[PDB]
């Protein structure tokens with residue numbers, strides 16, 4: 001009876017693993033599972049081009065995973081661990097801004113990013129709530145990152161094996177509970193975008 | 201600047217209201233917000249064509265809307281209100297089945313659904329969690345509803361005048377805490393699809 005068994009690819013298995021960790025992040029209330037998913041988001045694309053299984057079904061599945069792990073999960077983790085009337089306001093504006101970001105990503109292509117990508121935007125928020133324990137600072141930073149996600153500031157995507165790797169060991173360090181390296185590297189990636197937008 | 205303002209439309213505004221509702225359904229943990237979320241999804245697309253402001257961005261955003269409203273929200277709702285190791289395995293399979301069936305819907309342009317639609321599958325699950333206070337029974341149906349989503353059962357989609365109205369009149373009674381008519385219409389839709397498939 002099942003038909004999509006003929007359209008699933010080996011790369012789609014990894015995206016499914018990415019959705020589990022992103023969903024388990026919500027159910028388990030653990031910031032660590034997002035960092036694992038940020039990696040998963042970085043490899044399932046590499047896998048597809050390495051295994052040759054580039055599918056529009058898997059391309060859609062890639063963004064749906066980003067909706068779960070990088071849109072809903074950072075917003076839920078923001079509110080649940082910082083219960084506030086204002087954090088409620090902030091989580092919605094974030095998770096929406098991420099949803100607008102991915103909707104534009106679907107109508108565009110792999111050329112690059114129009115605004116701060118949602119895996120980076122998610123990493124910024126999640127890492128900030130781990131290090132900064134205050135309702136306001138993370139609620140105000142989520143508004144800032146959400147604006148930078150629906151931004152027009154151009155962002156360069158370069159899936160170098162070494163590039164993906166240097167982000168990976170930074171995220172593996174974050175899986176333990178040492179995300180300061182992931183914080184620095186993405187915030188430097190974010191401030192590299194703003195200067196380039198002003199003038200290359 | 202924010203150049204999404206030129207591609208944004210009135211049809212996306214209700215789509216955004218749908219994401220807020222399905223999002224608030226997660227954080228505030230009340231099944232009534234999904235019943236209002238099924239109304240938006242059954243309306244925002246109708247709103248688009250009535251004003252002629254359909255769009256791929258809104259088409260993608262409509263899919264992103266159903267990812268959290270009818271995938272992450274019902275899975276989290278099933279778990280958080282029936283916190284079981286047992287219920288965790290079911291919530292994941294329901295979410296991934298919804299994510300898989302949403303990846304298939306995005307790549308197809310048919311006047312129906314190849315599986316049980318994710319707006320109806322979410323109605324069935326949370327409707328059963330509302331009426332049945334049992335960790336186990338809700339969990340097996342979540343698995344069963346999951347398989348129906350990733351099925352080949354051809355389902356009808358005639359978003360006309362009264363079919364939405366009838367479905368959505370019952371969906372308002374679903375909000376107030378009377379989901380029996382919403383479930384009755386939803387469960388009839390489920391079996392009618394499988395009896396139609398059995399007919400073939």
Ligand SMILES: [Ca+2]
Pocket residue numbers: 040041042043044045062
């Ligand atoms: Ca990816």
Ligand SMILES: [Ca+2]
Pocket residue numbers: 240241242243244245262
């Ligand atoms: Ca819709």
Ligand SMILES: [Cl-]
Pocket residue numbers: 101104105108112113114115
């Ligand atoms: Cl983009």
Ligand SMILES: [Cl-]
Pocket residue numbers: 066101102105116117118119
């Ligand atoms: Cl993104």
Ligand SMILES: [Cl-]
Pocket residue numbers: 301304305308312313314315
């Ligand atoms: Cl479909």
Ligand SMILES: [Cl-]
Pocket residue numbers: 266302305313317318319
């Ligand atoms: Cl659907």
